[PDB]
Design a protein around this ligand. Structure first.
Ligand SMILES: CCOc1cc([C@@H](Nc2ccc3c(N)nccc3c2)C(=O)NCc2ccccc2S(=O)(=O)C(C)C)ccc1OC(C)C
Ligand SMILES: [Ca+2]
Lengths: 254, 55
């Protein structure tokens, strides 16, 4: 997160930290006691599927305070339409091996209904983005959870307000832009998979996933987020499904 | 009705027989008698920050 602030301990209680061999991989969002939503691209280079850990109640990476809860990731479900090394359909649904225990520091974010998300949530201008990613472009990652408030843009306006680049991916209906073109505030690579959380009438909801962009808080470029509202039915149907052998599962989308 | 201002609902809105509307809540919440408001039924409902709620 570039140009944000420290999320006070327990204020982003749905934030997930994904680890592979004890190293920082990505972020994620807890949606209930056993399921985590993250980005499909976080798993593009994974070879050891059995060393994937999700940490809930995390805040400061340098110290163990006792509120952290670690769980093995039993399953990583990716849509059939997602192609590794590309940007479209950037979403993963993670099943934890054992449920986490809800506490003041571990709370799920609401996965909203599609209609509510499209009709109401998509019109809330500002939303929070969080993670332990890069504090600057080509800079060090954060030791404490960082949070940034970003405004959402209509795709036409994002394309009109952006500096044109070669081989730059298209902004599909499975994505949305959010952030600033002035190079001061963005989510970045280490924040990938993390939540884009929207407040509505006293409750927070999952509207986006940190997905991609140019560089990191690059002038003339906005952050691109997976548009979670396209995946509600897909996510809900999978959460009602029985676990399958093997970590990675590709599931038909739609 | 749901199309405009969330049909007055705090959370989810379902349209019915023309002029009818039903508000609904996410699990861990129940709808109040006003027919729009959602109240938590559990200790840790989704989308609420306990440290802020207890403050
Ligand atoms: C669909 C994802 O595609 C991309 C992801 C990223 C990185 N992520 C982000 C996220 C938000 C960003 C933002 N808001 N502003 C600026 C830059 C941003 C960069 C990234 O994760 N890099 C590392 C990476 C990239 C792709 C597969 C595995 C990995 S990885 O194995 O390192 C994994 C640990 C993330 C960069 C370029 C991408 O695509 C190009 C074609 C435009
Ligand atoms: Ca810690």
């Amino acid at each position: 997160i570039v140009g944000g602030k420290v999320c006070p301990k327990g204020e982003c209680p749905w934030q997930v930290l994904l680890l592979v061999n004890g190293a920082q991989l990505c972020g994620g969002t807890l949606i209930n006691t056993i399921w985590v939503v993250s980005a499909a691209h976080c798993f593009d280079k994974i070879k050891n599927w059995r060393n994937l850990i999700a940490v809930l109640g995390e805040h400061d990476l340098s110290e163990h305070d006792g509120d952290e809860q670690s769980r093995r990731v039993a399953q990583v479900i990716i849509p059939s339409t997602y192609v590794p090394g590309t940007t479209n359909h950037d979403i993963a649904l993670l099943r934890l091996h054992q449920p986490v225990v809800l506490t003041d520091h571990v709370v799920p974010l609401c996965l909203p209904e599609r209609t509510f998300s499209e009709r109401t949530l998509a019109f809330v201008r500002f939303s929070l983005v969080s993670g332990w990613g890069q504090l600057l472009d080509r800079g060090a990652t954060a030791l404490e959870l960082m949070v940034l408030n970003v405004p959402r843009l209509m795709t036409q306006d994002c394309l009109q307000q952006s500096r044109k680049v070669g081989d730059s991916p298209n902004i599909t209906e499975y994505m949305f832009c959010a952030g600033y073109s002035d190079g001061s505030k963005d989510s970045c690579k280490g924040d990938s998979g993390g939540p884009h959380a929207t407040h509505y009438r006293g409750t927070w909801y999952l509207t986006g996933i940190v997905s991609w962009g140019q560089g990191c808080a690059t002038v003339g470029h906005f952050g691109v987020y997976t548009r979670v509202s396209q995946y509600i039915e897909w996510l809900q149907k999978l959460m009602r499904s029985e676990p399958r052998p093997g970590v990675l599962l590709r599931a038909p989308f739609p | 009705i749901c199309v405009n201002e969330n049909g007055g609902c705090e959370q989810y809105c379902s349209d019915h027989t023309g002029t009818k509307r039903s508000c609904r809540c996410h699990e861990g919440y129940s709808l109040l008698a006003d027919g729009v408001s959602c109240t938590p039924t559990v200790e840790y409902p989704c989308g609420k920050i306990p440290i802020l709620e207890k403050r």
